[PDB]
Amino acid sequence: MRHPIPDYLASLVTELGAVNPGETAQYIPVLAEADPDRFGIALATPTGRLHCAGDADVEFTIQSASKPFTYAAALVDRGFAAVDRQVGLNPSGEAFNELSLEAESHRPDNAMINAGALAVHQLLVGPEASRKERLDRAVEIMSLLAGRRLSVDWETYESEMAVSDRNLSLAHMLRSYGVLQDSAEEIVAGYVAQCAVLVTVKDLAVMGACLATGGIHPMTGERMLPSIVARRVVSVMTSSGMYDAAGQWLADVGIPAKSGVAGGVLGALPGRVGIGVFSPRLDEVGNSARGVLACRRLSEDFRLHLMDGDSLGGTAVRFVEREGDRVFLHLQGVIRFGGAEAVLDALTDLRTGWDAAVYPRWQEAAADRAALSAATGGGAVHEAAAAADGPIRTVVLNLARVDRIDDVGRRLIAEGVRRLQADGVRVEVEDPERILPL
Amino acid sequence: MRHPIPDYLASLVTELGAVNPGETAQYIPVLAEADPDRFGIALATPTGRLHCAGDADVEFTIQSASKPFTYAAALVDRGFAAVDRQVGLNPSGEAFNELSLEAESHRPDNAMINAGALAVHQLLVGPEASRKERLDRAVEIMSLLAGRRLSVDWETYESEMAVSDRNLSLAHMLRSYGVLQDSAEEIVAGYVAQCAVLVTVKDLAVMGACLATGGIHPMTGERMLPSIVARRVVSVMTSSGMYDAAGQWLADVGIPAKSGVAGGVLGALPGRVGIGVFSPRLDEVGNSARGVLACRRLSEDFRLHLMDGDSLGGTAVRFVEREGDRVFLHLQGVIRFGGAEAVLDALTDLRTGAEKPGTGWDAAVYPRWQEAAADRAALSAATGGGAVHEAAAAAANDGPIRTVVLNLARVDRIDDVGRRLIAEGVRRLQADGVRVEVEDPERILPL
Ligand SMILES: N[C@@H](CCC(=O)O)C(=O)O
Ligand SMILES: N[C@@H](CCC(=O)O)C(=O)O
Structure with a gap:
């Protein structure tokens, strides 16, 4: 008997794959030229399974879906006090408002937004770690959770580094308030290289599963992260991961997630499943269209939600x-x-x-x-x-x-x-x- | 033998009870004159137990802790479309900005804030329900989950109805945008009575457990609310219930909650426990001081969180x-x-x-x-x-x-x-x- 879960996913891929609204990220040619005709999805379960369908074995830069893992790393490397001093927990959208630094809590709002992500990378290994040490660390945590050595797609890296004025701007502003000690270029480069790490839908699923189980790797039973760190991460993803999506994600979908402009959507539902979805084209808010829709379908068809008992x-x-x-x-x-x-x-x-x-x-x-x-x-x-x-x-x-x-x-x-x-x-x-x- | 949890609660009451910071709600004399020296707590489990300590049986007005329940009743009576057309899901604090209504949908941000709570009461029974019918409905939904007929403390009602200019303002603005159909006074009066419903720490716990279990009454096994509705209510509580508390509630505590200016705090942790805490004095932001501090301790001592697996x-x-x-x-x-x-x-x-x-x-x-x-x-x-x-x-x-x-x-x-x-x-x-x-x-x- 074939497992019914993978057949559902294949059917879902086929159904939602009948159309392909939106467009690939335009900010860089390497991503804009990307073949849009791709659609994959994978489910990593605590039961050590990996139910998949569609183009689930195709690599793609993880982009900002990497934010939750480097965040976890930073917490592990420096402890909660050191990270929270630079990164807030205030839910927020990507648009930058200086009052968050000049007043309010006096630090970037959260780790899901670029300003926070930059501060997080700056925190990675330690107070005096080198540029390379920090990148190796970002690549390492994502690799340890994925279960295999991941690589940086340098083609994409260069492409993006040539058009990173906005991130440089945030980096320079952070330096201004003490959040970054190293140069804007150094941190932005680390963060950009970090976004260039290549993963597949399956990788993301397994990676999310680690968070979903509270830090336990579903394929080996080995504790990868302290349950306290894994919770903080999923909490933050819940509050800001899908901040600008239509409706209200937590109430509508209930699946903590984060989308990457390359088309990959990461999901992590405590105690149940890790989700990975790949669909190049983005909707108008900048999230993978089908990627988002697939998640909404998983939430409804399987009746999954953060709030269920x-x-x-x-x-x-x-x-x-x-x-x-x-x-x-x-x-x-x-x-x-x-x-x-x-x-x-x-x-x-x-x-x-x-x-x-x-x-x-x-x-x-x-x-x-x-x-x-x-x-x-x-x-x-x-x-x-x-x-x-x-x-x-x-x-x-x-x-x-x-x-x-x-x-x-x-x-x-x-x-x-x-x-x-x-x-x-x-x-x-x-x-x-x-x-x-x- | 004696169940350890209740004794844990007792210790906690004695401990946190050594001090009594903050002050009682100053907006109305009835609440401002209430005996500050009171502190009770209760936990209602899915199994059907009710562990508690302190003044867990002293009645008090539920105030805003009534919001998640009237909201549930509205969804049950009107359906999601009808309610979602008038009550948004956008997380926000109590501070009111007319802009939130200038949106394309025209609705207050969520059911946890006054503006939203008012929109909720207006929806309570049907398009044509009467004032008394809606009030009765509010008192009912709360009574059904508590497991007993609750009553409105009219002494508190009157006191507050004499100083409701702010809520009257929200009601009027909401009418201006078509969110309310009846007079501002009629809806505000309903919502204030709703807040005057008398409950105890134990009542809140049981009531919260009902949401926590997805709509099943822990003491009888009867379904009181469709699970889809229970989830919507707890989701909303999670997003705006403690919006202006110190730190970030979801991350630091992880127990969807709501405080009332009379000193009561509601808790609902999906699949594990319904929480009720009572401590008259409020902190700077307006939530029960010990009540809030108690939830933090429950979260840390028992390692309870919405995100654990x-x-x-x-x-x-x-x-x-x-x-x-x-x-x-x-x-x-x-x-x-x-x-x-x-x-x-x-x-x-x-x-x-x-x-x-x-x-x-x-x-x-x-x-x-x-x-x-x-x-x-x-x-x-x-x-x-x-x-x-x-x-x-x-x-x-x-x-x-x-x-x-x-x-x-x-x-x-x-x-x-x-x-x-x-x-x-x-x-x-x-x-x-x-x-x-x-x-x-x-x-x-x-x-
Ligand atoms: N590398 C992109 C982030 C892409 C994303 O939002 O996933 C940037 O920092 O602009
Ligand atoms: N009945 C109160 C609300 C109490 C509370 O915030 O819990 C009011 O509208 O002022």
């Missing part, structure tokens, strides 16, 4: 079974706050230790324990209450099926186990991969 | 076992795209096809990706793919798969998207000549 919740509890005086409680999945909250509910539900008259409806609902759990997604948390003959003397906490867990989850469960013992219950933790400590 | 994913697959010619594939949790993708992955992973799968990537090009895909189990746990890998393990030397048992008993619910995908994956399995018997006791697969 697709969480582990009560499913963190695989099951709760009772054998005489001891109860077996098995956990599973990726346990964070929400997962841990459910576990504690299960523990407390084992009677080892609102007003029902005010809310009669709430009581008739909690009466059919399994039904309410089904309608809400409590997984197997309800089974605990079912377990609670004689008194429970032992509780085995099995974490074999738990993929991973954060300190918050570790802290909560640990505290949970402690209070169980404080009830006189013996608790033995079966943790083969020992992920509970620390 | 707490998804079912591969866990949608409970397990995949095999007995000779048949495979038992059990699913679970709340399945939507995420889970369904993982399921299709498991079905496909069973090599029931005559052809060999297309990896999409070149093994010789990504040696690191191969080595990882080798220890299938390790890659799965490091990822969060649950049991999807057991499928490839089942495929892994003697005998073709003839039967696949797809059990959904452990599945809480599935959305049409996943319901469509799984149905298609099952059809393709049968197209391979594999017998598929779906054990679906609660019939959740059809439609």
